[PDB]
Amino acid sequence: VTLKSRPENLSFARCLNTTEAKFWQTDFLKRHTFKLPLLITDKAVLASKGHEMPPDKLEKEIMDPNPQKSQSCTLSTECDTLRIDFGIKVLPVKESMYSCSDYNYRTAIYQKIDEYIAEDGFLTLAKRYVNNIANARFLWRNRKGAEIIETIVTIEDKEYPSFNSKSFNLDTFVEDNATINEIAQQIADTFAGKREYLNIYVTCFVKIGCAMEVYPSQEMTFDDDDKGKKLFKFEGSAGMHSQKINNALRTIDTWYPDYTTYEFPIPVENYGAARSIGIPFRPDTKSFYKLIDRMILKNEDLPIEDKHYVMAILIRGGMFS
Amino acid sequence: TLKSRPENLSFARCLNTTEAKFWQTDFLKRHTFKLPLLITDKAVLASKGHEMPPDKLEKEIMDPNPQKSQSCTLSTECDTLRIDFGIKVLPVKESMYSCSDYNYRTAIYQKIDEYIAEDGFLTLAKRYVNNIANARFLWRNRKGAEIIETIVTIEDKEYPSFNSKSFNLDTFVEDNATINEIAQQIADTFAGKREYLNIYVTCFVKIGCAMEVYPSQEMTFDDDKGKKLFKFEGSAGMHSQKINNALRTIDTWYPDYTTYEFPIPVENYGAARSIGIPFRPDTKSFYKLIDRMILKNEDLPIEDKHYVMAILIRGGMFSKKQ
Amino acid sequence: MMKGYILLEKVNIENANAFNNIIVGIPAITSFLGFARALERKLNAKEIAIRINGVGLEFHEYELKGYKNKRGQYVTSCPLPGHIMNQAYIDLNMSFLLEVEGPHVDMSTCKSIKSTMETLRIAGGIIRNYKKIRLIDTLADIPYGYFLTLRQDNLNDAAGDDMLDKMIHALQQEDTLVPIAVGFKALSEVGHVEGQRDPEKDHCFVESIFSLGGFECSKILEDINSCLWRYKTEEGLYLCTII
Amino acid sequence: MLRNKILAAISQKIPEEQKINKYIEGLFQSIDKNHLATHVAKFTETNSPGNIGAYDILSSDMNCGYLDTANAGWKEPDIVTNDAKYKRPQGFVAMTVMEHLQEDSAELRHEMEELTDKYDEIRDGILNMPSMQPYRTNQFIKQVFFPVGGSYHLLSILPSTVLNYEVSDRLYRSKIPKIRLRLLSSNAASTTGSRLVSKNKWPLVFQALPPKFLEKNLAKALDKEYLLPDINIDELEGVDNGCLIDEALLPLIIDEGKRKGEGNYRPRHLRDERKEETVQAFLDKYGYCNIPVGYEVHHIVPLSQGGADSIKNMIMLSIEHHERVTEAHASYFKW
C-alpha cells in the first residue's frame, strides 16, 4: 500500500468554471431598467515609437510612421455605467479528477480531500473566492476610476443584497459580512458533493463616467502582420476571457513564503508565478510539485496554510508526471 | 478439430454510431427552438505549469506566448445543449465481413447460435442502451446539470423520455419497462430476426445560461499547439468514436471487480484509458477465451461469454499472431 | 433482361476513407463500384438476381475531416488508436445512379434495395440517411449535383516528359480537374500465396493506378452513359473507366 | 566535404582513419542485410509481419494513359531495412549522391578510393542489392476483392512509397498545384525500413475534393433543417377538433409564421415536399376520414419561409380566413 511515484496522467478539471464576461452599457440611476449593447469600435492609431533605440535610426523611426488599425471601445455620449454579466458553475472537487492512472493515488487523494472536508470544509477558500467576487477585481484596469461599484450575485433565482466594492480593499479579506458567508457556505457545500452543481450569475455595475473608455480583453492578432489591438467580441458585444475572470477569482494565495515582506496576494499557480511582478513567489519548497509529493507519496500532516494552498490549485487543473 | 485461429478474420461494428450534432435550445421551448451552436475562438496565454527543476524557472515563466484556442459556449439567451445522434445496428452473425477457414466459421456460427438460445443478447442490449439511459455520451458535459432528458426514437415511434439523473453510472439497472422493450428490440435485431434497426437519440442538458459546452477535440497532429474542436457542418459535435466508446462501457465482469467497482469499455486486453494497467492481462481476455471456447470446446461461465460476445459486437481484427 | 436506372438520392456517407496514398479526398472509385457489386452480391444472396453493370457518382456535398489553418492548407483529422498510420476521412452527400439489368426492374426491387443498402458501407463509411430511391427515365429525373467523368483526354494531351509531369501541367491549366484513383495494376503473377482473405480466390499483388477526372453539372451533362462508370479487366491492369 | 561527411558520420574516441576503416567494413557488411524495393507493405500498417514489398522498375514506361510507379518520375530507388542494428547504408546514398551512384560518375569513386578503395563492388552491391519480392499477404496489408469476368480476384494493395516521395518533391516545386494537402500523421519512431519515408515523415499529396462551393457550411445545414411553430395546438382554446374556428386567436396564427418566417425564405428546390401522408395523418388525428368541407390546410410557418411537412406544423383555415392569411403572407414576405 506504499506509494512510489505520481501518476503519468494526473489531470484535475476546473471546479470553478466561469463564463465569458459580457459587456453592456447603462445609466446608474436607472440600471435595473437599462441594458444597451456595448460595441467594439475601430480607430486608426499612428505609430509613436517609444521603444529604446540608439541615436542611429530614430530619424528613420520618425520619417515613416506606419498607421495601425486598432479596435478600441468607447461606450456612448449617453451611457454612464458598465454592466458585466458573467456566470460561474462550481462543481465538487472529488468529481473532477479527469484522469488518474494508478488507483492507489486515487483513493489516497479521496481520503486526503475528505480529511480537509472534515477540518474547514472549503469555507476559508470559498469565503476568499467570494471575497474576490465582492471587491470587484473582475475589472482589472476598468476598476481604476469609479464612484460606485456595485456587484449583485444571483444564486438560482435569488437576488442577494448588493455589494459595495470600493469599501472592500484589494489587500485584505473579510470574514464578517452575512451575505458573503452564506454565499460561501453554499459554495462550500457545492465543493463537497453535498450539492452537485451551483450556477452563480454575477452582474457588476461600474460608473466610470459618461463617454469614458472601457478596457476589454485583448485577443492575439493574426501572425501575418496586421499588428493592432484586436479586442474580444462575444455576441456582437465586448467581453472578457474566462481565463481573466478565473485569474481574478483565483488571487486567494496569501500563504506564500515572502508574505510579511510583500503583503500582496498573488494568483494561484503551480510554482507561484505572477507574470506582472516576476521572481516566482513559491519556488522549490511550497510548490505543489513538491507539496503533494510530501502529502500523498509521504504521509505527514502539513500546516493548514499549506493545506489551504495544496487543495486550492486543485480547482485549476493541468498536471502530469 | 481446429488447430488455431484464422488468418484473415475480421468482424465489423454491430453498433454503428453516427456523429452527434450539437444545437442550443431553451428547456421551456426545446421541442421547437434549435439555434446553431458554433465553435468560437479565443486567445489564451500559456501558463507554463509543468514540473521543472527549481533553478531554471525564471526562463519559462517570464516568456509566455499566446495560443488561439477554439472554445464552445452557449448563448446568453439559451441554456440547454441538444445532442442529436443516430445509431444503425446490424446483426453480428452478418458482421463477419471476412473469414478464412470455413470450419472456424461454422464453429463461431454454432457458438453464437448457442448463446442466442441461452440468453439471446438481452443483457448486452440492456447494458448498451442502459449507457444511453445514464447519458454517458455527454462525457464531461454532464458533471453539472438539472434535467438531462434523453428521448429515443425507433423508426417513427418516440419511446418515453428518460431522466438520466436518476440512474447511477456504476450500477446497471434491469427493471425498467422502457429499457426492457428497447433492449428486446436491439436483442432481436442483434439475433438476426431483423436485419437493421435505426435508433435516433436526442438529449437535452441544462448546463445553464452562457455556460460551456465541451465537444470532441480534433487530433491536430500539427504545429499551432491549440485546442481545436470538431466543427461538423459549422456546428459542434462529438467524434462518433467517442459516442460508441461511451455506449460501450458495459464490462462489469473484468477480473478483480469487488475492489474497484466501476464499468470499463470493452477492448481486447481490457485496456481502459483511465486506469493505465490493463484489467484483463492473461487468463481473462478475448484471445484466450475464443481459444478457450472454439479451439477447445468447453462451456465458459456466462459473464465470460457476455464479455467475449460484447467485444465480438464491437468488431476489430480478431486474428492470429502470424 | 430489361435495363433500368435506379437513383439513390442524398446518401450521406460519414467517415469514408479519403486517404488513397498519393490522393487524399475523393476516395478510390473502386470503392464506389465495389459498393455496387456488394449491393448486387447481397441482392443475389436474396431472390432478386440483379446484375449491376455500371454506376454513376454525383457528388452533391462534401466535407473533409480536419481544420483549415491560417494559410489555407487543410489539416486532416483521424481517430486515436487503441503510432497513427497515414489516414484521412471524408463525409459525402452523394447520389448514386445504378444501371441495372436482369429479370425485371420495378418499385419492389427499389424496396429491396431500400432494405439491403441499410446494412452496407460505402468506402468504409456508415450511412446516416437516404432521401429517396426512384427509377429515373431521363437526365431531368436527376437532382442538381456534379457527376465525376473521367477526363483522360486532358491527361493524355498534356505537355510533359512523364505522365506525372503531364498531370502537374494539367492541374495547372484547368482548375475543375481533380486527380482521382481508378484501378489496380498487377505487381506479380497470380497464385495461391498464403494468408489470404478467402483461400480459394487467386491472389495478385497490386498497386493503385491514378488518373485525372472532372466534374460535370447535372443539366449540362449530355447523355447518361457519358457519366456511368464500368469495370474493365485487361491482363494485369484492373481498372474502372467511363467507356 | 564527402570525406568530411564520412568522418563526421562516425565520431568516436577511435582515430578518423580507423573510423573510415570500420565504416567501410559496415558498408560492405550491411548491403547483404538491407534490401531494395519500390513498395513496402509496412507503409500501410507498421505491424506487418515480415518484409513484404515489390520492385516496379521491371514494368516498362508508357505514355498511353493513367499513372503507375513505372509510369512516373521514379528517380531515387528506395532502400529498405528490417532491423536498424544491421543497417547504415543511406549515408553513402544520401549524405543527390543516389544520382551519383546512378549516373556512372567517378568522383564518388575518387572519394571512396581516398577512403578505403573498393568503390566498384560497393557500386555493384547497391546496384545488385536483393530486389524485394512478395511472398506473403498479412491481415494488415489491405486485401480487396475485385471481379475478373464473373469471378472475384483477391488484390492485396502494396502501397507505393516511391510515388509518395516523387509527388512530395514535385508538389513543393509546383508551389501552387491547387491539390496540396499535407499529411502530418507519422511520428519519428517509424520502424518502416524505407529510406524515403525517413527523409519525409510528413508526405505532401494531392487535395482531391469537389470544387469549393459544394462544401457544407452552417448555412447548408440550416437550409436542410425545417422550422416548426411553437404553438401547442393540442389545447389552444379557440381551436376545437383541430380546426381554427375562432377568429380571435387568428393574429397569433399570422404572427408565429411571420416570426419564424422573417428572413427564412428558402427556394422551392430546398423546400419540403407536400407529401399526402401528412394530410392523411392529420385527418387521422381526429376522425374526419377526409378533409372537412370548407376547411383546408395551411402551414402555420410558410413552406417557402423554411417550413416542415410535419404534423405539429399544419392547421385548417377557413376559406375566407385562409384568403386573409394568404394575403398576409403574400404581403409580408414579398413572394
Side-chain angles (χ1 to χ4, degrees), chain A residues 6 13-14 17-20 22 85 88-89 91 95 100-101 103 106 196-197 199 201 219 232 234-235 241-243 269-271 273 275 280 283 289 316 321, chain B residues 41-45 47 49-52 54 57 61 66 68 73-76 143-145 165 207-212 214 259-260 262 273-276:
Chain A
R6 206 169 62 242
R14 276 193 307 280
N17 185 342
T18 57
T19 74
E20 304 311 26
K22 183 170 170 180
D85 40 308
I88 317 168
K89 182 188 305 180
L91 294 180
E95 326 219 21
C100 188
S101 61
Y103 194 82
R106 183 180 206 120
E196 330 157 330
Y197 69 104
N199 303 8
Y201 291 105
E219 223 177 0
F232 182 34
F234 175 104
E235 297 186 2
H241 289 147
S242 71
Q243 289 97 9
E269 260 216 310
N270 311 352
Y271 283 86
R275 53 158 295 181
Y289 272 122
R316 153 179 172 51
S321 183
Chain B
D41 297 0
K42 92 182 46 153
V44 317
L45 188 69
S47 186
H50 44 89
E51 35 164 58
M52 146 188 193
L57 313 167
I61 271 169
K68 207 61 185 301
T73 176
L74 284 200
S75 325
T76 314
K143 265 177 300 185
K165 290 189 56 61
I207 52 142
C209 325
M211 288 297 317
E212 293 173 0
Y214 313 169
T259 326
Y260 288 31
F262 83 108
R273 333 275 309 251
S274 86
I275 307 327

Side-chain angles (χ1 to χ4, degrees), chain D residues 96-97 99 101 105-107 114 116 119-128 130-132:
Chain D
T96 71
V97 181
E99 169 277 6
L101 330 179
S105 60
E107 39 285 40
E114 280 192 359
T116 322
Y119 173 86
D120 49 299
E121 70 303 20
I122 264 49
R123 172 177 191 71
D124 296 359
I126 49 58
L127 228 40
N128 72 5
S131 293
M132 192 22 56

Side-chain angles (χ1 to χ4, degrees), chain C residues 58 60 139 142-147 217-221:
Chain C
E58 217 184 5
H60 296 203
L139 262 299
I142 292 110
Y144 197 106
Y146 287 87
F147 283 95
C217 161
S218 310
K219 309 151 289 213
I220 303 299
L221 166 73

Side-chain angles (χ1 to χ4, degrees), chain C residues 29-82:
Chain C
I29 306 306
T30 302
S31 268
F32 286 157
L33 192 40
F35 182 36
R37 300 304 292 292
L39 199 31
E40 145 201 309
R41 196 154 161 222
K42 302 195 186 318
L43 268 196
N44 316 352
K46 277 164 43 27
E47 307 294 356
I48 304 292
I50 275 178
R51 48 170 51 180
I52 314 180
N53 223 340
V55 152
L57 330 177
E58 217 184 5
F59 279 53
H60 296 203
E61 292 150 299
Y62 86 96
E63 174 173 20
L64 191 77
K65 252 54 145 152
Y67 59 93
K68 265 176 332 163
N69 65 345
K70 40 190 177 303
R71 304 189 294 293
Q73 295 190 120
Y74 289 35
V75 181
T76 51
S77 298
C78 52
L80 188 276

